[PDB]
DNA sequence: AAACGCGGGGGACAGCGCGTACGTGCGTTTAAGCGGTGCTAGAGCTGTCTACGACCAATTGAGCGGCCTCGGCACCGGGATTCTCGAT
DNA sequence: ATCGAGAATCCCGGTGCCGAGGCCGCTCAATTGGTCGTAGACAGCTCTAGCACCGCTTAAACGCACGTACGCGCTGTCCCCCGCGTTTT
């Protein structure tokens, strides 16, 4: 499923970041970085879900997880 | 009945802010002036962002503020950018910078 | 007519820095989120907004990282980003 | 409950002909809640540090000076002081 | 301060090892810091779930969120063992 | 009188931890097991650091733990280093790294 | 008083940081960085002092200021 | 006998990375602290431990910054730290 | 700690061989859209009883001194470990 | 890359001395029973509703293949600057 993050998608993210030229080894590196980030946030979000005795991860669970990792997100109920 | 907001000349709710302080596990007691002061500060900050966001909307020939306009207002102001440094505005995008 | 290498790249920068839309395809991203969450808890459901919140945060994080990676490349007198630039940015950020 | 009504009231004062999208309203609601938490949490710490059981306008003022940067703090303090003065004279 | 308890624990893990006053101050700061982190997270969890009581469940969840890797695994074991022993007096 | 610490088989003070939770503006009520659980966790973490610091002291032919030994124990352990990432140990120095 | 932070002192700090060679323009740059850092911490520490109605900045005031700027210090009462 | 440039520098690294003592002279640092605080409040007194706490934090901060500055220099294929390295480290750190 | 005397690794800049990634176009998935359903899980409602708190007496663990003896700081011996400078 | 003399760091060490936490004594305060009152956490229980699923269509983006221009990493050379040491504050 990590391959679903295609080279064109990674290129678009780099373009928004102001990147003009990209090495061929960046795509695999980016996939690894994104996986680590997602794992960290999802782990905490699921912890909140289990504490609420819920079977559904809510947007609030994600917002709380981001907040505690110092990546506060505005627009999803906090 | 005269609302504490109208007594303080504010649009923000002093009574609600007081309840949120009392039930937010911040202290045992809350002074009468604390909610008034907090409500005024929240109102001032909202006015500042909204004024700057409305200007950005007018510059984009728009009559409604969208997340993009809020992001433009916050990132183009050194002080607002510092206050909201670790904050992500959903659908806000980035500043054009090459 | 053939645009010189770099011209279309700069045109894409201008277009994506002006837009606010999500750049990762939604369905593949949703599959990744569900696959990662399976290792923490089985039979997990997800609010549509939960997946959207995750996508917004991930894209913001990667764009921010690409900005710092670019600065590292320019620092080494290069215009091309390489894994060593990503590694330095993350190390300095504390990641 | 949300701060939507109050954000709209303030918007109509600073920009009478300007509206706001639901997404932008959600950002504003998140912003107010976030700043509230920051100020109240700092005021709570100040009270505890000074062995006090009450959060008063003095604690809020000090929290504002510690959190808001530069002129943001200067003007926010003016607004808060003016509001308390007007309220005490009803 | 937690000086007496830090010394008791030190004598259990290292019977012939002492500790300087400076090092004791570091340990006191450490205990106070971790206490605040756990209690503050437990407070947030209770508020998020509209609960008025911080129980051992809130503490356990806070420990999982704050302590990294095996630190959390062993800390949870210690906390669970203590609660079980306490409930049987 | 039997202390709650002795009932839980702990060296850390359950009664003091309970009071600090009740007077720390964390919640309206505190369960009976919460201080027991928290005290055990604090005790476990102290034991871990002290054991690793005592080993560092013995490696330095010292019989007393100093801040240097604590810094060595924390920075040489990936998990303890992560937990205390944004923490400065006074008179701890740095890891020899060239 | 900023000149009291001498070149040898800055060199010692760099040596602990694992630095082998230092440019001559680093000393003035370091002095500027240190000044900004100190100003930020002292500003907050004095704010705590004024709130306590004290005329003496305490170690606790400094510890609190460092804590809120994400630079927690152990060894001085917290 | 003359040691080659770099030999004594590496010897100093080994010595200071093994020690934990403060590297800034105490009296000059105290004067700087008092001079900076004067702009915030006049007639300010300072606990001896307050000045010591400030010194410990400042030295830790500068040593940490010099570590990241060094990584930036090595990244640009240099062994010498320059202001551009300090600037990059601080920018990436968010300072 | 500050200022002066050499000085040679060191940084900075010009050449260039070459991988290497940007641009472009064709075919293939495969994601987006739309429609319909299911049911399992989230949300509101009601009884209750167990786990929470309130007041309070005490006596015992815990904090404030207090004297001291052992380990840490120091000082010259001297020992072997590092670094410089000729030659295979 | 290896091998010796010649100096020049640190690390080990026996000796001496002194500061400071450790066991001890004292004090006071607070932790723990103890009983009673009460309040929200459990347990259904009931409803509903929100996305897993499917199925089909559709069309826009992803791979791949190729062409080809352009930065990368040495490689070498110029000059020049922090260092090491020495001498004097």
Numbering used by the authors:
A (entry chain F), G (entry chain B): 25 to 102
B (entry chain C), F (entry chain G): 14 to 111
C (entry chain E), H (entry chain A): 39 to 133
D (entry chain D): 35 to 124
E (entry chain H): 36 to 124
Give excerpts from the publication.
The nucleosome is a fundamental unit of chromatin in which about 150 base pairs of DNA are wrapped around a histone octamer. We determine the cryo-electron microscopy (cryo-EM) structure of the overlapping tri-nucleosome, in which three subnucleosome moieties, hexasome, hexasome, and octasome, are associated by short connecting DNA segments.
Purified human histones, H2A, H2B, H3, and H4, were mixed with the 353 bp DNA fragment, and the histone complex was assembled on the DNA by the salt dialysis method. The reconstituted OLTN was fractionated by sucrose gradient ultracentrifugation with glutaraldehyde fixation (GraFix) and subjected to cryo-EM data collection with a 300 kV electron microscope.
